[PDB]
Design a protein around this nucleic acid. Structure first.
Lengths: 82, 40, 97, 49, 97, 80
DNA sequence: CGCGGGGGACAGCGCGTACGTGCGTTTAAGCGGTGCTAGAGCTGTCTACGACCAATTGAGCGGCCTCGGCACCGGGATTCTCCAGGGCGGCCGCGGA
DNA sequence: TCCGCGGCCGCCCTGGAGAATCCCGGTGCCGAGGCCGCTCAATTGGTCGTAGACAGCTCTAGCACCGCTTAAACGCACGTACGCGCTGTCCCCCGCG
């Protein structure tokens, strides 16, 4: 729950995700590098989310909070709380 | 509706896809495009 | 003889299935453990509601699927079909990330 | 289970099948379509909730 | 003994010279009447001022040079010394276009 | 007439040299010319639209700046 | 997590030609000038043209509950593909007179 | 030198086989949208203002050309060397338990 859960996105999970990109073979070192990329993106989103949460005088983080966090990325298409 | 309908409506329309396609699709999935060099 | 399919044969009907079906493909409880373990560092003892978790996984799944499609396009551009580290880094760099 | 239920297609099939509690709970969707005659529940104390 | 340099090194010295000097690579009047032609079809009887056109040429040059740099990075990705059409299309498409 | 060809083959060769390419394919020159046409048409449709809105027959620097603003280019310097 | 293996990633070397660089000679722009006139622009102006709350108002919603649709196998040749013999691309070699 | 013939015999085509197809129904289930309350700001009316183009001077530089002076382009001829073709190698993750 709070210790070494980065393996939640597992190697078979990464292989299945790469199946959706249209690839036949996934190399061994692909899994951990895409894990690091996902970690970086998730950290970048959640930093903005938690900073907004602190600004809003709120203790809980809502879905619309991360919606605004991703809003300044610059696309903002459909989704919950759009 | 299933959000797959939303994804099909977006991706089958050229102007919608050209306008914006990065932010999450709400349970609509994607359109996995395959190539003609993979499958035997 | 056993009906051993050649590599790349089942993939046809498999992509026929999962292109139409629109369910999730990642274990939920490990993912919520991950989002917790990354949240406590930013803010401990967060009282997570039932929401604000599925949106994150859907967004990251869409982003990584787009990145994987771009990586496959780069691999085909590289006169090959398989994925590799260089394909991923080139796709990410050309995406502005 | 697919091999077991491949022969389940024939009408006038096996006179009886045996499936446990949680297996029935999980495969209710597969089982709800077929019509049966005699259902037997064992140790109805465990099913008391 | 004619003095003919081996191919490739003069390319490097040209690259260095173009790196030190940051002048416009396309003559002003060619861009002028190209813009005039491309604006003829949209609306007729349009007069272009002295300004607003050097900005167009500098923006086009800068973004096209960035595209060339991405294309060359993808060419090194392809392990070759030549630019290719698939290189350019991968550079364009993966940039959100 | 035929003014797009005014950009010469040696000019594209030097431009690709700026891209750090030792040997450049022959079709690459015309491909670069074609993507340049697409770039200019994408910019200049918006520029002409803004010019027509602005109640002005002359395309000003601010006109080009506003045309470039929407497409994400956001240039600096000219009309900043 | 484990193994067979086979299509696919990655490299070595010849082709040769495809740009690349060094010869002359241009086609059209830069600069000096100009004479104008044609578009860009704020000031008296004055009017019409937008905003907001009284009497009404309608209109869409707040909440439930029916029911024609969701989910997918009994039910299944064909599609999708994979793998073993047959005639063959013939290939080819070797030897009496 | 003919060519009879015999062998290496192994490969696309053909027949057999493995799993799925996406509807016909069964059984079970599933929350949209109209309907007793409602409410509430919208819609005209009157007042307030105000500023923003109609003229009108204005002002200032665009521009098309007249007339010199070069600048990279262009063709060609040879260099060469590296993508590509052709081929060989190995490899390690896909399919399956």
């Amino acid at each position: 729950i709070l210790r070494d859960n980065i393996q939640g996105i597992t190697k078979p999970a990464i292989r299945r995700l790469a199946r959706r990109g249209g690839v036949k073979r996934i190399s061994g070192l692909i899994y951990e590098e895409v894990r690091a990329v996902l970690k970086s993106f998730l950290e970048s989103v959640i930093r903005d989310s938690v900073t907004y949460t602190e600004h809003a005088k709120r203790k809980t983080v809502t879905s619309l909070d991360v919606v605004y966090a991703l809003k300044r990325q610059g696309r903002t298409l459909y989704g919950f709380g759009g | 509706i299933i959000p797959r309908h939303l994804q099909l409506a977006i991706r089958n329309d050229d102007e919608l896809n050209k306008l914006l396609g990065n932010v999450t699709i709400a349970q609509g999935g994607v359109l996995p495009n395959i190539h003609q060099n993979l499958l035997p | 003889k056993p009906h051993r399919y050649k590599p790349g044969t089942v993939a046809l009907r498999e992509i026929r299935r999962f292109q139409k079906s629109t369910e999730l493909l990642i274990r939920k409880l490990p993912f919520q453990r991950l989002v917790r373990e990354i949240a406590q560092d930013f803010k401990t003892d967060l009282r997570f509601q039932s929401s604000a978790i599925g949106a994150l996984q859907e967004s990251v799944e869409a982003y990584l699927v787009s990145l994987f499609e771009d990586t496959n396009l780069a691999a085909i551009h590289a006169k090959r079909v398989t994925i590799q580290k260089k394909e991923i880094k080139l796709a990410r760099r050309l995406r502005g990330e | 289970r697919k091999e077991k239920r491949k022969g389940w297609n024939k009408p006038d099939a096996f006179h009886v099948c045996i499936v446990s509690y949680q297996l029935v709970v999980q495969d209710q969707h597969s089982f709800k379509r077929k019509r049966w005659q005699y259902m037997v529940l064992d140790e109805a104390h465990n099913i008391k909730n």
